[PDB]
């Protein structure tokens, strides 16, 4: 079956790093996880994380991303296609 491309390698590769400490699966993408469950911190620290991340792509988070933003799952599929 399919599933072989940089598209599904970006979110996977990135998660492969945190997976060490997080010891979680990248397939845990869900709105019931958020940074609290998925990430090892709170949105407090994530604020600057995404804030600076969007600056690298030149796009408003609460404006552009807001079009379809909700939880980590959204950012995953977002940065996935955003870069490809």
Swiss-Prot record:
Keywords from the UniProt entry: Cytoplasm, Fatty acid biosynthesis, Fatty acid metabolism, Lipid biosynthesis, Lipid metabolism, Phosphopantetheine, Phosphoprotein
The record's account of how the chain is modified after translation: 4'-phosphopantetheine is transferred from CoA to a specific serine of apo-ACP by AcpS. This modification is essential for activity because fatty acids are bound in thioester linkage to the sulfhydryl of the prosthetic group.
Pathway annotation: Lipid metabolism; fatty acid biosynthesis
Domain Carrier: 8-83
Residues annotated with O-(pantetheine 4'-phosphoryl)serine modification: 43
Transmembrane segments: none
Pfam families: PP-binding
Domain of life: Bacteria
InterPro entries, per database record: ACP, ACP-like_sf, PP-bd_ACP
PANTHER family reported for this sequence: ACYL CARRIER PROTEIN, CARRIER DOMAIN-CONTAINING PROTEIN
Function field: Carrier of the growing fatty acid chain in fatty acid biosynthesis.
NCBIfam families membership: acyl_carrier, PRK00982.1-2, PRK00982.1-4
Entry similarity comment: Belongs to the acyl carrier protein (ACP) family.
The protein, known as: Acyl carrier protein
């Amino acid at each position: 079956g399919p599933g072989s491309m940089d598209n599904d390698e970006i979110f996977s590769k990135v998660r492969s790093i945190i997976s060490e400490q997080l010891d979680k699966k990248e397939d845990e993408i869900t709105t019931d996880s958020r940074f609290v469950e998925d990430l090892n911190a709170d949105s407090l620290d994530i604020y600057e994380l995404l804030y600076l991340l969007e600056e690298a792509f030149d796009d408003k988070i609460p404006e552009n991303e807001a079009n379809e933003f909700e939880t980590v799952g959204d950012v995953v599929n977002f940065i996935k296609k955003r870069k490809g």
